[PDB]
Structures are given as structure tokens and as C-alpha cells.
From TrEMBL, chains A, B:
Parent-protein start and end of this portion: 389 to 437 of 721
Family: Belongs to the etk/wzc family.
Highest taxon in the source lineage: Bacteria
Protein name (record): Putative transmembrane protein Wzc
Organism: Escherichia coli
Domain Tyrosine-protein kinase G-rich: residue ranges: 1-49
Location in the cell: Cell inner membrane
């Protein structure tokens, strides 16, 4: 199975059309959390109450 | 001799005609069943009642 995969991956690489994909921006993490959004949660709680 | 040349060309052409399909992901089963959807069934039962 591993060799079948190696053959398949090699065919995948060989049949690759894109000449060279480039990494413009390496991954970086935003220090401000995206969830939970405290303000909207509190507003929703107050309105629901 | 020309027929022999055409034979060699046809043999190489037949041997080289391989590709057009490069399966990316193999068959994989989702362990979570898709049917029946228990929650919607229970909700429908309660609402119908």
C-alpha cells in the first residue's frame, strides 16, 4: 500500500501543471481571539432578558 | 518495411497512451451515519403530536 501511494504521489507531482507556487505570507496568528465576541454576547443576553 | 514501421509506431503509441485520471482521495467512509437524523426526527414527531 505504501509503494502504491508512493507511485501515485509521484504521478501527482509529475502531472503538476503550475510551474512554481509561491508563499507570499507565511502563517501568522492574530493575538486577538475571534471567538467568543464578548460585546455581542452581552448585548444579546441583555436584549433576550 | 513501411508496414513494420507503422507497426512499431502503433505499438509505442498504444503503450504511451496512459493517464487522464489521477484519483486524489481514495474511498473513505464517514463513521457518523447520515441517516436516520435522530434529532430532526424527534423534533418532527413532537411538533406533529
Amino acid at each position: 500500500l505504501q509503494l502504491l501511494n508512493r507511485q501515485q504521489e509521484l504521478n501527482i507531482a509529475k502531472s503538476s501543471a503550475i510551474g512554481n507556487v509561491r508563499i507570499i505570507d507565511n502563517a501568522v496568528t492574530d493575538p486577538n481571539p475571534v471567538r467568543p465576541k464578548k460585546t455581542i454576547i452581552i448585548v444579546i443576553g441583555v436584549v433576550l432578558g
